Amino acid sequence: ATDMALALNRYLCTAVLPLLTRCAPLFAGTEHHASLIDSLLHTVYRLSKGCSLTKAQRDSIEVCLLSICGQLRPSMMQHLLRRLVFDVPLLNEHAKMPLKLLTNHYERCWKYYCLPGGWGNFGAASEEELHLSRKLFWGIFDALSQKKYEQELFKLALPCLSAVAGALPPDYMESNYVSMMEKQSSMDSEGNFNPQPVDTSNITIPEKLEYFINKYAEHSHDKWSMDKLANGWIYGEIYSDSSKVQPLMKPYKLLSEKEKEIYRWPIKESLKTMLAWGWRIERTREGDSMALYNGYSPRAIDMSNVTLSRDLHAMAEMMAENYHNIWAKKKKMELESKGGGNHPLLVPYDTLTAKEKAKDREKAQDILKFLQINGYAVSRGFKDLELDTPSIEKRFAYSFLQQLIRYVDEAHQYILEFDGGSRGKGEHFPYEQEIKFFAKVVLPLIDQYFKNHRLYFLSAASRPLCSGGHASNKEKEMVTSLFCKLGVLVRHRISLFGNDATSIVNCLHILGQTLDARTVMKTGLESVKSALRAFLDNAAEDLEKTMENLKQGQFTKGVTQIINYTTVALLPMLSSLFEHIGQHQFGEDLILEDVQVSCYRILTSLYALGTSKSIYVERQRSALGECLAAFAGAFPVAFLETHLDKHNIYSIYNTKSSRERAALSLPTNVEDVCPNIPSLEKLMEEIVELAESGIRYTQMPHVMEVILPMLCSYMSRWWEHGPENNPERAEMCCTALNSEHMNTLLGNILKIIYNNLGIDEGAWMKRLAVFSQPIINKVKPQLLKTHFLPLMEKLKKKAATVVSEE
Amino acid sequence: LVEFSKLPEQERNYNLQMSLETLKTLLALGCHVGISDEHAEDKVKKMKLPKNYQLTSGYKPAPMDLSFIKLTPSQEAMVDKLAENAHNVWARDRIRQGWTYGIQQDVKNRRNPRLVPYTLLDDRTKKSNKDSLREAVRTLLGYGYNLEAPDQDHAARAEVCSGTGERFRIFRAEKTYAVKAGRWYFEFETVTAGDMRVGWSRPGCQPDQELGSDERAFAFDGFKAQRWHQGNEHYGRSWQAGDVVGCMVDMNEHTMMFTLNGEILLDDSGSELAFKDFDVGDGFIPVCSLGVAQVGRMNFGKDVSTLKYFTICGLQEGYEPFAVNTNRDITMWLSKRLPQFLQVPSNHEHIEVTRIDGTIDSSPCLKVTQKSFGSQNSNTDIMFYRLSMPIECAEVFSKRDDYDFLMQTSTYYYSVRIFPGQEPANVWVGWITSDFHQYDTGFDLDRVRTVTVTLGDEKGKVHESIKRSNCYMVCAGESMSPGQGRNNNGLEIGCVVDAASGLLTFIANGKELSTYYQVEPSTKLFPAVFAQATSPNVFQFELGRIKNVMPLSAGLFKSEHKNPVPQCPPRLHVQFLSHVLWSRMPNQFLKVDVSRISERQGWLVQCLDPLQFMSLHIPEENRSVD
Amino acid sequence: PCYEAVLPKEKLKVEHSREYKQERTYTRDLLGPTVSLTQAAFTPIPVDT
Numbered sequence A: 001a002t003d004m005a006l007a008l009n010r011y012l013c014t015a016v017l018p019l020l021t022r023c024a025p026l027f028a029g030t031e032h033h034a035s036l037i038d039s040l041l042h043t044v045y046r047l048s049k050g051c052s053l054t055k056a057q058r059d060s061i062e063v064c065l066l067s068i069c070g071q072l073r074p075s076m077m078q079h080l081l082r083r084l085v086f087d088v089p090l091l092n093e094h095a096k097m098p099l100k101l102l103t104n105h106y107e108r109c110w111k112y113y114c115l116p117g118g119w120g121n122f123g124a125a126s127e128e129e130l131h132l133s134r135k136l137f138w139g140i141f142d143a144l145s146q147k148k149y150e151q152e153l154f155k156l157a158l159p160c161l162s163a164v165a166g167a168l169p170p171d172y173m174e175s176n177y178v179s180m181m182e183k184q185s186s187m188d189s190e191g192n193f194n195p196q197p198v199d200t201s202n203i204t205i206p207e208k209l210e211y212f213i214n215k216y217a218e219h220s221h222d223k224w225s226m227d228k229l230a231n232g233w234i235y236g237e238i239y240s241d242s243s244k245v246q247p248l249m250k251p252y253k254l255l256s257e258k259e260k261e262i263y264r265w266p267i268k269e270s271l272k273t274m275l276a277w278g279w280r281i282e283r284t285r286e287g288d289s290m291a292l293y294n295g296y297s298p299r300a301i302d303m304s305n306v307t308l309s310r311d312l313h314a315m316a317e318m319m320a321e322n323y324h325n326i327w328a329k330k331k332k333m334e335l336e337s338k339g340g341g342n343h344p345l346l347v348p349y350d351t352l353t354a355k356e357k358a359k360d361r362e363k364a365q366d367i368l369k370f371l372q373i374n375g376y377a378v379s380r381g382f383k384d385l386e387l388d389t390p391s392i393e394k395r396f397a398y399s400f401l402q403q404l405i406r407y408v409d410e411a412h413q414y415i416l417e418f419d420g421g422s423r424g425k426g427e428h429f430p431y432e433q434e435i436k437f438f439a440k441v442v443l444p445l446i447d448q449y450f451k452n453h454r455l456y457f458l459s460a461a462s463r464p465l466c467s468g469g470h471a472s473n474k475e476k477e478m479v480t481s482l483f484c485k486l487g488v489l490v491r492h493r494i495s496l497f498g499n500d501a502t503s504i505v506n507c508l509h510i511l512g513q514t515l516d517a518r519t520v521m522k523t524g525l526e527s528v529k530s531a532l533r534a535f536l537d538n539a540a541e542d543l544e545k546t547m548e549n550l551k552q553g554q555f556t557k558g559v560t561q562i563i564n565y566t567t568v569a570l571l572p573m574l575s576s577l578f579e580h581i582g583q584h585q586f587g588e589d590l591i592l593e594d595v596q597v598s599c600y601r602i603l604t605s606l607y608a609l610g611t612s613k614s615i616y617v618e619r620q621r622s623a624l625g626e627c628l629a630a631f632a633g634a635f636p637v638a639f640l641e642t643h644l645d646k647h648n649i650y651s652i653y654n655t656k657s658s659r660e661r662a663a664l665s666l667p668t669n670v671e672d673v674c675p676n677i678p679s680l681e682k683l684m685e686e687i688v689e690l691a692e693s694g695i696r697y698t699q700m701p702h703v704m705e706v707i708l709p710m711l712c713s714y715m716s717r718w719w720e721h722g723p724e725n726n727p728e729r730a731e732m733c734c735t736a737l738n739s740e741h742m743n744t745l746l747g748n749i750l751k752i753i754y755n756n757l758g759i760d761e762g763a764w765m766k767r768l769a770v771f772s773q774p775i776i777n778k779v780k781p782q783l784l785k786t787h788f789l790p791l792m793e794k795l796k797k798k799a800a801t802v803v804s805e806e
Numbered sequence B: 001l002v003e004f005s006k007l008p009e010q011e012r013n014y015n016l017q018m019s020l021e022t023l024k025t026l027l028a029l030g031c032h033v034g035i036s037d038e039h040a041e042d043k044v045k046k047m048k049l050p051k052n053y054q055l056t057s058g059y060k061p062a063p064m065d066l067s068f069i070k071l072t073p074s075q076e077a078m079v080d081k082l083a084e085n086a087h088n089v090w091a092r093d094r095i096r097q098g099w100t101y102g103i104q105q106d107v108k109n110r111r112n113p114r115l116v117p118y119t120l121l122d123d124r125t126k127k128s129n130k131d132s133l134r135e136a137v138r139t140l141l142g143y144g145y146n147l148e149a150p151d152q153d154h155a156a157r158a159e160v161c162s163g164t165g166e167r168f169r170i171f172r173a174e175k176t177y178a179v180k181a182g183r184w185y186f187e188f189e190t191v192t193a194g195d196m197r198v199g200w201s202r203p204g205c206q207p208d209q210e211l212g213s214d215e216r217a218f219a220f221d222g223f224k225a226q227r228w229h230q231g232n233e234h235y236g237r238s239w240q241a242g243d244v245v246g247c248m249v250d251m252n253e254h255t256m257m258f259t260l261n262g263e264i265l266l267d268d269s270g271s272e273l274a275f276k277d278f279d280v281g282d283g284f285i286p287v288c289s290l291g292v293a294q295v296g297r298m299n300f301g302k303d304v305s306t307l308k309y310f311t312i313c314g315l316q317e318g319y320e321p322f323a324v325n326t327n328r329d330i331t332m333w334l335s336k337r338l339p340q341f342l343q344v345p346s347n348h349e350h351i352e353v354t355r356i357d358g359t360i361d362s363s364p365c366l367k368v369t370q371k372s373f374g375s376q377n378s379n380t381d382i383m384f385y386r387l388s389m390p391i392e393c394a395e396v397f398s399k400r401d402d403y404d405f406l407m408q409t410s411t412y413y414y415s416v417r418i419f420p421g422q423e424p425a426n427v428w429v430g431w432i433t434s435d436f437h438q439y440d441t442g443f444d445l446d447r448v449r450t451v452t453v454t455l456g457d458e459k460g461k462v463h464e465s466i467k468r469s470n471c472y473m474v475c476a477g478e479s480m481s482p483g484q485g486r487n488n489n490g491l492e493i494g495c496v497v498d499a500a501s502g503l504l505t506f507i508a509n510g511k512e513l514s515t516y517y518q519v520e521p522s523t524k525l526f527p528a529v530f531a532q533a534t535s536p537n538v539f540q541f542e543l544g545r546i547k548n549v550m551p552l553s554a555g556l557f558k559s560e561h562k563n564p565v566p567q568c569p570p571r572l573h574v575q576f577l578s579h580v581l582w583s584r585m586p587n588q589f590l591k592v593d594v595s596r597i598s599e600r601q602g603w604l605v606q607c608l609d610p611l612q613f614m615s616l617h618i619p620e621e622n623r624s625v626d
Numbered sequence C: 001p002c003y004e005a006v007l008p009k010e011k012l013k014v015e016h017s018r019e020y021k022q023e024r025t026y027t028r029d030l031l032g033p034t035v036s037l038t039q040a041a042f043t044p045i046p047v048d049t
């Protein structure tokens, strides 16, 4: 409320902050003065915690701090980060700038955290920073879950959470020693300036430590006597200040005990702090050998050249903190004793500046160097109790996915309650607030996590991320159970969603791409295995019931919206499922046990869709085509080899015999199962005669939109299964196919291109070209030349046309 | 062959305790132990074999049905390590006995060819004990105790072992063959796949630094499919064994290209140029980096027909082989293996040597200080320092201060002041010979190379034993005998050499140390200090003079042979043992013919063609180079 | 006798103590650093139980 403070805020925000913002490039090299830049960061954050800031001033601090941190290095930001992570869970509108700062900070230091090597000059985090970042992630995620729905707050936090998740290594094993023993000033919620020291009068001196304070008081006495005579003090028995005479040049042994106290009592206090946190120091044997030793000179050794260890430096840093905190306590009692005014240096030790810190540094170094010269082996009071590193649960990804399955099962229950309330009158629930959080955060957080660490989930020690970071097999079936649960959550739940079901769809597509369920199939939890089978069977039976009821109801709306859901999300979702199955070549083991039969029946259904015609089929023609192509890519059996499919050793009829299937009311023959689907031979003869006829697309669009694409998927997958690739194992394998097959088929494709050059046209050429790209990769360049170069000439001879094509 | 009771009870004890040690091994492997139910054991399974397979023991001929014990893959994967440990115990007991491996089995010499690692052991014997162990472990679970397999650990060492500290060797053409203009092509045949890098390097490339890590080199790390210049990008495809990479440069437009088995390598983006813009500078020369156990071949296109991918790619574009019209083969230069002593550079990242002139009251001094201490990249490794000139021992060993004694004497003195704050046990002081070319991160006085020639009389008496070593030094840790360290007098080890007698005596803070060295006549002795950086200031040489001893300059130099005043002429300078030096492969090696004549005649080695090289001998360093 | 020290799978052969010999320049096998042959000496290492 003071007026100058307003004037000084105006001055800073108008002159200094804009100037330092324009100075952003200059702040790069700062390892020299990291301490003062850290103090600058801390004080800028303190000002950003200014209540009396105008909106313009607040924006000025926001821009300045973000710009400075943008280039400056996280090996300095950690100090401000521990306060940022501590004050963000309040989640007030005041902390939005800190939230943005963390958001873009993790993004700009992405590779430092995610990559174990990071930037070579930068290195890697000390993993205590990783611990605090993990605590930050959990704190924001939870407090956001309990937090009431604020639109802007979730718009801001979601990028922050995604950035933190991407930065944190998924395979980060939680440190066996969780971090305690923090200073009370950090735990100090208000301002973080309460400098309470620890209680240390209880502990007592050992005999080795009293021998240590012996001759150390002698060292300090002699050096301070040198200082006295430098100041001018002379060996005059009278203590005269102006005369600079003092009888105190006598040795510490000759000193009286009264002068020893207060001279040595703070040494006792420093040692009591030494033992207060519990560090134990072990003296070597020269320490008492010199005691037995008793040309010698009572003059002080200089400890300038020697240096201490880096971990000991870290411990000595918080010792500089504790001594400054006692100092700040005494000046606090001074401030409420005076009852008026403020202290220029009431700021915490980290907020302090290096030059005045130098006294604490020299104190810590002199005491530690003295003890290590005397032989006391100083280290932490106790080593880590036990290592649970075999517990893969403490992996950050594993624990996070545990909690993520927790929230996903919760959301499944909330959808069950919402289904019960859809039968009820009310679509309004308090739980709708929590589902807003789920859909708007967890779903995109899943999205970003799998986009960033998809190779980690593919990492199962099969050398994705050759540096390491494998997703454990159990982590992987719980990933697949998450996939199944999201399927259930999206199971005909469009209206329960805010029409945001498209977001869940995209989540399933990318999660499907990240699926590595083959290793789960080989080794995994059988209940989750059955859950996956039930998933792909429920989705199947839904698609067939919809595709029949769309024909028995072709002549004409709950079933209608069910059909819409199926053909808009489920069919795309399973199409992407089948896509990643094909591209990984992983999932052939998924389709073994009744999955094969369900897939033959799905093939019959998709064939019926492709052959059938309706306006909505024309709407979904590209979707149907890519669905058929995806199925053919995923499917393990040459389905047009029906004459010899009994030779397919991998087919379940060969594998688990057929005895029980034959007993049950099933055709149990591939030819019996798929009579509507044509055979290989008549299929090529029909499509070849159609091509040489050269009709437009519009007469028989279905062929070119579904089967020729699905025939393309067929050639692409079964090229290596054909003796065209391996003439060996002939009649030792089911699939017999020749390169001339798809050679004639591509010649046919070119002829259709020629006869459709004149008229008709559409995006269907471009999409079939996309599907034909792998086939034109398989084709021979000698075939390319000759068989396509005239077709390139035909692609250019329609100069009048404007349609785009290869 | 009988029941447990009649079977001798000490053999019973050995069988029992080996079963105990076997299950202890299962525990040490982390195999969880559990039984489905005690009833499954209270009802043991039985089947019987014919009379020939019957025995005195009433126990069933094969109680455990071989049918329903199908061992599980993790358990078979465990049995082989169990056999590993069993053979380790066997061989360790055999060594306790005192046996040793002999390719023929012996008892009087008591040798066993089977006393070898299991991976190299006889297949028949290993499978015999292995099937015994398989059967035992399988019955161990079939006995009701469904033992839970431990984790199938995937972690592998990935073969990080390398001979000595050296990790890779850099092969490059001579600097004079650098190209400043034109367009050039050479091939690099990768015999083995691995951490190989190949490309074009500036003449300033250092052998020790990784190829392309700095700005000097431009390489293609095909092992990880990465470019390498001032950092790594992603480019090209990884090679297979036998793949050939053509390194391809056109200095006119400052471009670089790489190909693999003829096909061009492609950037992350669609561009085909590996490196888009660089500087001509002082030219480029071919270079390759070869990792551990990596074999590669350069083909500089001496005979253009030898290049095999040049025709399909490189010739039509207009590129020229590197040895397009050279009459004689290009001389390759590679990274030197043995470290050598070279003068400390002024721009050295870590060592700073400042020369202190000698005043009237202060001896001339050279101090070694480390610049980067307390900062990141500070070197805690031991570094080896030596003076540039050696003291000469006498040709034949004879068998205030008195000016006459100083003029007739041949003892020389230098001393080293470990700076207060530099830890004494990490600093060694004394003399080394010219042959000290061994580098170690941790150097111990016990490791020094020594040999003792024992010339004997006719009947074999040891009438003369001569110790020979390259390192004659002592540590300050045991020289700090009185204890503690004086600021007024920092730890001051002095070295006294008697060139007339070859006796090396060390004095510490005015006290003569017990350690003394006797050297051979005509021995080159370099003053040397080995130190580990524990402070910004480590040590300094003192060229002073103690009573009745000549100064070091009187021994090192010839003109000052009779000048008792200490001197530090500019020729004397501190050198340090370093790896940054190249070496030259001779253009021609000796004809050596090796063959086994027969079983009787052994192996023949014959060389009949002479080769000679002019040797340049640096007199002060006792070193010779081609 | 020295022939007794040959490893059972290996064949004794007299060879250039140094890696490089005289041969054609493009056929010159440039050998990188080798792996230390610590495995030559077989010291049994029983596990501690």
Ligand SMILES: Nc1ncnc2c1ncn2[C@@H]1O[C@H](COP(=O)(O)OP(=O)(O)OP(=O)(O)O)[C@@H](O)[C@H]1O
Binding pocket: B010, B011, B012, B014, B015, B016, B018, B090
């Ligand atoms: N299960 C057992 N484990 C260890 N020692 C045993 C066991 N059963 C018997 N022994 C004792 O070990 C010795 C085996 O004699 P043997 O001649 O086979 O020994 P070896 O030549 O040292 O080598 P190895 O036992 O490996 O064939 C005998 O002294 C025997 O009493």
